[PDB]
Design a protein around this ligand. Structure first.
Ligand SMILES: [Cl-]
Ligand SMILES: [Cl-]
Ligand SMILES: [Cl-]
Length: 236
């Protein structure tokens, strides 16, 4: 097949709140081969600093960190096969479990995606929300794996224990984080890793001496943890 090979920003589109069926404004990134075969899906949730009302103007905030930052800057490899959606959370705190559920339902209904390869990822509030999403919806979640950075999964693991270990998770945290305590990732990932086989893959990365921003070095691969290859190795 012949394939679009323009840099990633060429396929980045703003989808403001109330221009789609979604309950969030979001950034839409389509991979080069979108449409040719069902694509893996990645839904990324931003941190609290980037909250906004989902309008086009407000959505610019979401470009600050994570996948949409690299996509907008043409620093997101064309080899990456994901549809990447980056919704904006409105209001004052972290996205809720049901907000994340509803947006994942929208995404799967709307895009030509491989439903066996739905990936959830977030940083800070976006990770906190994703953990809470798993706590609420573990028994029905369609996701294949999650990469959760600088969040708090203690309630989710306290609730479910090794039942949660059926979802593959890679948790990341800086151990000097003064904003979200690193026990938030370390305790649940240690618990999940200790869970007996058969269980999903579980990984924990602790950046020693690193503060709250443990996401830049993760999503950019400057720290050498290939979260994209790991996600793609997971499926339902
Ligand atoms: Cl910058
Ligand atoms: Cl609020
Ligand atoms: Cl590093």
């Amino acid at each position: 097949a012949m394939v679009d090979d323009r840099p990633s920003s060429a396929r980045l589109s703003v989808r403001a709140l109330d221009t789609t069926e979604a309950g969030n404004g979001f950034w839409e990134y389509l991979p080069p081969r979108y449409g040719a075969e069902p694509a893996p899906l990645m839904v990324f949730w931003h941190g609290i600093g980037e909250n906004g009302d989902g309008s086009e103007a407000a959505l610019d905030k979401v470009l600050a960190n994570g996948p949409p930052r690299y996509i907008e800057r043409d620093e997101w490899s064309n080899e990456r096969p994901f549809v990447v959606l980056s919704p904006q959370h409105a209001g004052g705190g972290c996205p809720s479990a049901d907000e994340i559920r509803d947006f994942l339902a929208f995404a799967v209904d709307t895009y030509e995606v491989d439903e066996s390869r739905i990936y959830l990822t977030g940083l800070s509030c976006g990770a906190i929300g994703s953990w809470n999403y798993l706590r609420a919806h573990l028994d029905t979640t369609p996701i294949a794996a999650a990469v959760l950075i600088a969040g708090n999964g203690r309630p989710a693991f306290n609730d479910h224990g090794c039942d949660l270990a059926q979802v593959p998770i890679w948790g990341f945290h800086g151990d000097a984080d003064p904003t979200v305590a690193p026990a938030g990732t370390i305790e649940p990932m240690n618990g999940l890793i200790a869970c007996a086989q058969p269980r999903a893959d579980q990984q924990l990365t602790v950046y020693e001496g690193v503060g709250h921003d443990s996401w830049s070095r993760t999503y950019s691969l400057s720290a050498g943890h290939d979260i994209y290859a790991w996600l793609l190795s997971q499926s339902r």
